[PDB]
Amino acid sequence: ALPPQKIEVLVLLPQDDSYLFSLTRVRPAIEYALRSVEGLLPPGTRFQVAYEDSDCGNRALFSLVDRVAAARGAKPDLILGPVCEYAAAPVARLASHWDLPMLSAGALAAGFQHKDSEYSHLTRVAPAYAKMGEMMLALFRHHHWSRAALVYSDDKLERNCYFTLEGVHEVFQEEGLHTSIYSFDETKDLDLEDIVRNIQASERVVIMCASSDTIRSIMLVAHRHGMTSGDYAFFNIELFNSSSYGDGSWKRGDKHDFEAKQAYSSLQTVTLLRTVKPEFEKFSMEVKSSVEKQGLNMEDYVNMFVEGFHDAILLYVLALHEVLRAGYSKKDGGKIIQQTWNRTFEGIAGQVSIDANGDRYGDFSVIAMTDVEAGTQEVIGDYFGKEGRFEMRP
Amino acid sequence: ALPPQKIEVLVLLPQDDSYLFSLTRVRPAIEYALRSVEGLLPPGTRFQVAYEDSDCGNRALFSLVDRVAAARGAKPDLILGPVCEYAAAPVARLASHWDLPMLSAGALAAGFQHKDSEYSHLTRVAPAYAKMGEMMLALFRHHHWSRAALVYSDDKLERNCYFTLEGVHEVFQEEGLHTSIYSFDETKDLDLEDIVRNIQASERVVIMCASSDTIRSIMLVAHRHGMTSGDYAFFNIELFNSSSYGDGSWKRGDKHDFEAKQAYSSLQTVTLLRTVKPEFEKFSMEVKSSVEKQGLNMEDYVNMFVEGFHDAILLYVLALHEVLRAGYSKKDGGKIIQQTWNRTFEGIAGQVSIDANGDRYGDFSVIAMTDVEAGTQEVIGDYFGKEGRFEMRP
Amino acid sequence: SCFGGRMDRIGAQSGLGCNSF
Numbered sequence: 001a002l003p004p005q006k007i008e009v010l011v012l013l014p015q016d017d018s019y020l021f022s023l024t025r026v027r028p029a030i031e032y033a034l035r036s037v038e039g040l041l042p043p044g045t046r047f048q049v050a051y052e053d054s055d056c057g058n059r060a061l062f063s064l065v066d067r068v069a070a071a072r073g074a075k076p077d078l079i080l081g082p083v084c085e086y087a088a089a090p091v092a093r094l095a096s097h098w099d100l101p102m103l104s105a106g107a108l109a110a111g112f113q114h115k116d117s118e119y120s121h122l123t124r125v126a127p128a129y130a131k132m133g134e135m136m137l138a139l140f141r142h143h144h145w146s147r148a149a150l151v152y153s154d155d156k157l158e159r160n161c162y163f164t165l166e167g168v169h170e171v172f173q174e175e176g177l178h179t180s181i182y183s184f185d186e187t188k189d190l191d192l193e194d195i196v197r198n199i200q201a202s203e204r205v206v207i208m209c210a211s212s213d214t215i216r217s218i219m220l221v222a223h224r225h226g227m228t229s230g231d232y233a234f235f236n237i238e239l240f241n242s243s244s245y246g247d248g249s250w251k252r253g254d255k256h257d258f259e260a261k262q263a264y265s266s267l268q269t270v271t272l273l274r275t276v277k278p279e280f281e282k283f284s285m286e287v288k289s290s291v292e293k294q295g296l297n298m299e300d301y302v303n304m305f306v307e308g309f310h311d312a313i314l315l316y317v318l319a320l321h322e323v324l325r326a327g328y329s330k331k332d333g334g335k336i337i338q339q340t341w342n343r344t345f346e347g348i349a350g351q352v353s354i355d356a357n358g359d360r361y362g363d364f365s366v367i368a369m370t371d372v373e374a375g376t377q378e379v380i381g382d383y384f385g386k387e388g389r390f391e392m393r394p
Numbered sequence: 395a396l397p398p399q400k401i402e403v404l405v406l407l408p409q410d411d412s413y414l415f416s417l418t419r420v421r422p423a424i425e426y427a428l429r430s431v432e433g434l435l436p437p438g439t440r441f442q443v444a445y446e447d448s449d450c451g452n453r454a455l456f457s458l459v460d461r462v463a464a465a466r467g468a469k470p471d472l473i474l475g476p477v478c479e480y481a482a483a484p485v486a487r488l489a490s491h492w493d494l495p496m497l498s499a500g501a502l503a504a505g506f507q508h509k510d511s512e513y514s515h516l517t518r519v520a521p522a523y524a525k526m527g528e529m530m531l532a533l534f535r536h537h538h539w540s541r542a543a544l545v546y547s548d549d550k551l552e553r554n555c556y557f558t559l560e561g562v563h564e565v566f567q568e569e570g571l572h573t574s575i576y577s578f579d580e581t582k583d584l585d586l587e588d589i590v591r592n593i594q595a596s597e598r599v600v601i602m603c604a605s606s607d608t609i610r611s612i613m614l615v616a617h618r619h620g621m622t623s624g625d626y627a628f629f630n631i632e633l634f635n636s637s638s639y640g641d642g643s644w645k646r647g648d649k650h651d652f653e654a655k656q657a658y659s660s661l662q663t664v665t666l667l668r669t670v671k672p673e674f675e676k677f678s679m680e681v682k683s684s685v686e687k688q689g690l691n692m693e694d695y696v697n698m699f700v701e702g703f704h705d706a707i708l709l710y711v712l713a714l715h716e717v718l719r720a721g722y723s724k725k726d727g728g729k730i731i732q733q734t735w736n737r738t739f740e741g742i743a744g745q746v747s748i749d750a751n752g753d754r755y756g757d758f759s760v761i762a763m764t765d766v767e768a769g770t771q772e773v774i775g776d777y778f779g780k781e782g783r784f785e786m787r788p
Numbered sequence: 789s790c791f792g793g794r795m796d797r798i799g800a801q802s803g804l805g806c807n808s809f
């Protein structure tokens with residue numbers, strides 16, 4: 001009743017493995033999803049995947065555009081990525097113009113929220129920074145806090161931390177909470193003094209985002225100012241790098257470890273609430289195998305990006321299927337994209353829900369030190385984005 | 395003696411005639427220049443000009459890419475515009491990637507200053523904000539002022555005034571001048587009370603940028619607060635439609651005209667220095683009539699963008715010539731862009747110089763109220779970017 | 789200040805939030 005459909009897919013992520021979502025780290029997860037899928041769609045249905053370097057910048061647009069201009073005026077069927085904010089905007093806009101469906105585990109900034117026009121064909125399968133903001137909001141109502149200090153590093157390039165706190169800002173502003181803003185370029189000489197003093201001037205609760213080592217330093221100077229130990233509540237966001245949100249975040253096998261350890265007693269770290277299942281185990285095994293066979297010193301496991309792209313593919317099929325039913329083709333991107341919104345499905349790690357606006361609902365955890373003597377850090381509370389409930393742990 | 399040439403140029407501007415640089419308004423200027431060049435180019439040469447709507451947005455990129463994709467890779471030999479900041483960035487980036495020369499009487503923002511990579515094929519024929527920022531620096535050193543309040547309206551859309559004052563901020567920064575920054579959305583619900591309060595709270599010298607009307611309101615509230623008697627020195631930037639003086643930029647035939655007149659006594663307006671020539675006269679008229687019998691009324695003297703685009707044509711022709719005479723072709727885009735830089739020529743309004751970075755040197759004037767009773771405003775001083783010296787009018 | 793050392797990425801999207809030192 002249907003011929004072997006053939007999907008031409010364009011994946012745009014960085015060739016450089018410095019990124020957690022590099023082509024080498026993600027490609028395996030994409031391939032995994034492509035087996036359990038080519039094993040819902042008519043038999044023979046194949047996916048032709050082109051893995052192109054986004055260079056986390058202009059390259060994403062150059063390659064997409066050179067590809068469509070070189071080979072006739074033919075557009076790929078699906079586009080995966082870019083992840084990087086400044087790299088995705090131009091591709092999302094073009095995708096919406098060409099009615100092509102675009103799915104990313106990134107493009108987390110607050111501006112992609114408005115999909116009435118330019119970003120209409122974009123569905124984000126990973127939690128946007130705004131979802132993270134709604135989380136802090138609940139964290140704040142819980143403690144009756146109403147004012148905060150947003151401290152972040154702004155490199156004026158990829159601006160990950162700036163877009164991150166922009167997510168908290170947007171939500172706080174629409175709700176009424178006041179917020180002192182303070183930024184610096186952790187790429188320059190850290191005047192970790194004006195920071196700690198501006199902090200001590202602004203508010204009692206501080207929301208931060210900068211490199212792991214930077215937050216460590218800031219937390220030290222603060223310590224040198226007796227700003228830890230109940231006076232101020234410090235928060236730092238580490239949503240993706242398992243290395244940075246793993247127990248003993250203070251410990252660096254260095255001289256400061258003793259001092260550092262004492263500062264973090266006032267520090268709380270925000271990260272994603274991950275869930276696993278048996279099937280998720282095979283996935284992690286095969287992915288590690290490829291990545292290692294690829295000479296890449298296996299990080300530690302599968303992050304939100306690797307996982308998200310795998311679920312992006314099953315999400316694309318789940319929508320192609322329903323578009324292919326109602327009498328449409330792989331060329332009605334707009335229709336496909338609408339079939340990815342407002343729904344729940346089964347990803348490699350558990351239930352995945354994309355909201356009415358095409359954005360994946362996010363669940364978060366708060367990591368705090370529950371034993372100052374030892375340094376035992378454990379999840380204190382969890383926030384479930386769909387339900388919108390924050391709740392401490394027993 | 396060479397074979398006739400066929401030059402394809404893509405003009406990307408807004409079709410909407412509310413902007414001063416709309417296709418309807420600029421086209422006449424382009425055709426004037428084109429006619430005046432033919433009799434530098436091999437005899438029989440011709441120009442194929444395509445006029446495409448930029449929508450002052452994503453459409454600039456949308457039609458450029460679609461046209462090249464349709465032509466199966468064929469590219470224009472010259473791109474004129476966009477003017478709007480967010481529209482020119484992507485076009486400038488592609489033009490560079492494709493080695494296509496791009497000239498514009500816009501793309502005034504600071505970021506376009508960096509042409510080592512991303513924006514190498516961009517030549518700005520109208521004076522950039524940073525240049526206007528150098529003028530202010532001269533004005534300031536002349537009055538021996540070293541601090542300033544920057545008050546501007548921020549659209550979060552086109553953001554002209556944001557980019558305008560960023561030009562001043564960038565210059566004052568490198569130099570050391572202290573600056574307080576304060577922004578508001580003049581479109582949204584205005585609150586002139588908070589504006590003036592921040593003013594008096596920070597610096598005695600204020601540099602503003604917003605609609606002529608919005609500035610007027612700010613000056614009324616300032617006057618009603620006694621800040622105009624001579625305790626503050628206000629400035630505003632109206633680089634493109636500063637023709638209200640001569641009758642009184644405060645005059646609105648409004649019932650506040652008296653207040654205004656007095657308020658504006660402590661206000662100075664920075665605008666472009668516009669020089670005349672017989673040619674400019676005849677050019678102004680024709681362009682004016684062409685526009686007139688088109689449905690639009692035009693300010694006696696054509697604006698900077700219209701004039702700038704005329705000189706862009708000449709400039710391009712002056713570069714293509716020298717490129718040809720050296721064995722290269724119109725397809726050596728970078729080589730053509732380089733011939734347009736660090737060179738001085740004769741535009742329609744007089745000399746035009748473009749620095750070693752491919753950015754035009756701009757001349758400015760400062761208008762002040764010379765007689766508070768009448769309300770007479772006059773250019774009290776001018777600045778000459780190339781010479782780099784500011785001088786009050788004898 | 790609400791500008792920072794630069795803004796490099798002018799013409800990108802980033803127009804939903806300031807900065808300041």
Ligand SMILES: *[C@@H]1O[C@H](CO)[C@@H](O[C@@H]2O[C@H](CO)[C@@H](O)[C@H](O)[C@H]2NC(C)=O)[C@H](O)[C@H]1NC(C)=O
Pocket residue numbers: 017018019020212213241243244
């Ligand atoms: C994951 O986070 C770790 C930090 O926990 C990053 O490693 C640090 O990288 C910086 C500069 O690259 C070094 O100066 C630090 O010494 C590193 N920390 C240690 C001790 O490992 C790591 O780069 C991150 N991984 C990714 C892919 O971003």
Ligand SMILES: *[C@@H]1O[C@H](CO)[C@@H](O)[C@H](O)[C@H]1NC(C)=O
Pocket residue numbers: 342343356
């Ligand atoms: C989302 O889909 C559900 C069906 O699963 C439907 O009941 C609900 O109304 C939808 N939400 C909207 C209004 O988009």
Ligand SMILES: *[C@H]1O[C@H](CO)[C@@H](O)[C@H](O)[C@H]1NC(C)=O
Pocket residue numbers: 412413414606635638691693
């Ligand atoms: C520019 O501003 C002046 C002053 O308000 C106005 O008279 C003129 O019509 C404007 N130019 C156009 C037509 O956009």
Ligand SMILES: *[C@H]1O[C@H](CO)[C@@H](O)[C@H](O)[C@H]1NC(C)=O
Pocket residue numbers: 736750
């Ligand atoms: C213009 O300045 C450049 C420096 O970038 C210099 O090389 C050149 O000689 C100057 N123009 C000429 C040829 O006089």
Ligand SMILES: [Cl-]
Pocket residue numbers: 012013014054055056057081082083084087
């Ligand atoms: Cl990317």
Ligand SMILES: [Cl-]
Pocket residue numbers: 406407408448449450451475476477478481
């Ligand atoms: Cl434009």
